[PDB]
């Protein structure tokens, strides 16, 4: 349940919070209309993360699901968070690399399903079924990382070296990080309880802050966001 992992939630809330502050206090006097978009998209990611992390800390984002012949502590707020933050991150990559509206739409769709599926899985009562939803969700995820890796990289090659390189870093960071989530989910309390909610929460915490604050940092501190 929620108590031993109260601390990881606390640190997460705080890190996202400061992350918002730092990104907010930096894009204040930014004239560049394109850079303006990047700060907006990027800043909104940690801000949302902050509200959802606070709901877990205060006990709201946590619920109980019966499965495995018992009651289970499921932090649902993660899906509420990700549902918006993942597309926003994706949007950042698309703008940076000037992707086609079609692909953005396809990418956003894939993402919504990825989280939608993950959320449903996290709540389904037939233990067994939770793993099907996981399968679907991961399939959706993989599609995204594919397009990002082979599709987006290609589009980056046409931009100026600054953008190509920043994208390369961002690309590597999201591909590697995003794929850890399904592994954590799988071995955590949402799936086979191989790992305690204690460590799991510390894991999502590190992954989230990296995948958002870190990503924001890499992106917002490069000249790539400028026209």
């Amino acid at each position: 349940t929620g108590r031993p992992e109260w601390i990881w939630l606390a640190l997460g809330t705080a890190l996202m919070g400061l992350g918002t502050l730092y990104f907010l206090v930096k894009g204040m006097g930014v004239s560049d209309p394109d850079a303006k978009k990047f700060y907006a998209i990027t800043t909104l990611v940690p801000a949302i993360a902050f509200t959802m992390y606070l709901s877990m800390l205060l006990g709201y984002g946590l619920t109980m699901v019966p499965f495995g012949g018992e009651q289970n502590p499921i932090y649902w707020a993660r899906y509420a968070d990700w549902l918006f933050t993942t597309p926003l991150l994706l949007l950042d990559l698309a703008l940076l690399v000037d992707a086609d509206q079609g692909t953005i739409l396809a990418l956003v769709g894939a993402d919504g399903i990825m989280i939608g599926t993950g959320l449903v899985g996290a709540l389904t009562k037939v233990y067994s079924y939770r793993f099907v939803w996981w399968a679907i969700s991961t399939a959706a995820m993989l599609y995204i990382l594919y397009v990002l890796f082979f599709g987006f990289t290609s589009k980056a090659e046409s931009m100026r070296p600054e953008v190509a390189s920043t994208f390369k870093v961002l690309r590597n960071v999201t591909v590697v990080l995003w794929s850890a989530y399904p592994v954590v989910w799988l071995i955590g309390s949402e799936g086979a309880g191989i790992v305690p909610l204690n460590i799991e929460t510390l894991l999502f915490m590190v992954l989230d802050v990296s995948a958002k604050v870190g990503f924001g940092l890499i992106l917002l501190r490069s000249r790539a966001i400028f026209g």
Copy 2:
């Protein structure tokens, strides 16, 4: 409840699933940026349909509402599905016919209300009230079919004959199909139980697959989607 209609759900899940596969395996090597958009929008429709049909089959999308002095089997997942798939379909028509942003916005709004209202109706406990929500939802629907029929057709007349004709087919197919839903809802378990959930599910199944896979087929196999 969910058992006698388990089969229609199963076939639906499967048909949507293959529908996604087929549309996915066809727009792979498509350079045309406009055609790319059409495949994205269209492909996402059956994909969502698949996840929601699977939730009904696995028992998740089903809930119980007390009304009529008794418990009632309400597949809520349909609204979760439609909420996204109906606008997407609408968006397809708008792109094809190059509609004004204003009308798209108005059309999307109408749709969200149409489903939002339908969902609320499906869940309201005062039997009587379910019919008011139905009224509102249908009113919203009618507005949409109106704009599609008289507004969009007009905009199609300015496109090349290929587009005008494909739109005509699509227009006829959506106008006729969409209007069956409110009739099914009305006579099914959501309203006056004149028809059993058994047949009702077989009905939504046929309507959905036609309105999505069929629509996708008609659209994605014409040269209308190209610039």
Copy 3:
């Protein structure tokens, strides 16, 4: 609970309803593509307000939350309403003043959090915690009114006098009205029950109709919406 304030809900439902009708019956024969957008955005605001007000009147939008060592009557539908209507209103201001996509995105984000936070607050069981969420929600709100007041006004100064002035009126009306909500929430049943749900409902009613129908009226009856 829901009974003594049944009337304010009834009048609200009716006022929004007519508000939709009036805005609908006025933008019918409007060729101007820009004006078309304004009518669409603006008309959808009261229309949504109508469906949510009807849910409160019919008893659906009302729920019960335990806090303060007792059961509490919480009209949740307000958040469902606002979640969409507030951005739409914001979008109106942005179009009118031709704001940057970045700022619109930032503004929409802030708003979603503002309502999301408000909703969570309205539902949190630890009385005490409801006030933190209020704090966050208001902080988000303030950010919005700031950008609207100092940012948007600046952008209005570049438009023709008609637009600058209409915006000025709209700006003053939203800044003043929006800031009353957090005060009402604070002193109403969602926070410290200093004011009865009776008067509270009459308050939100006046604020809503003004902030939407009034706003719509001021905007839709000026030549500012034309190109």
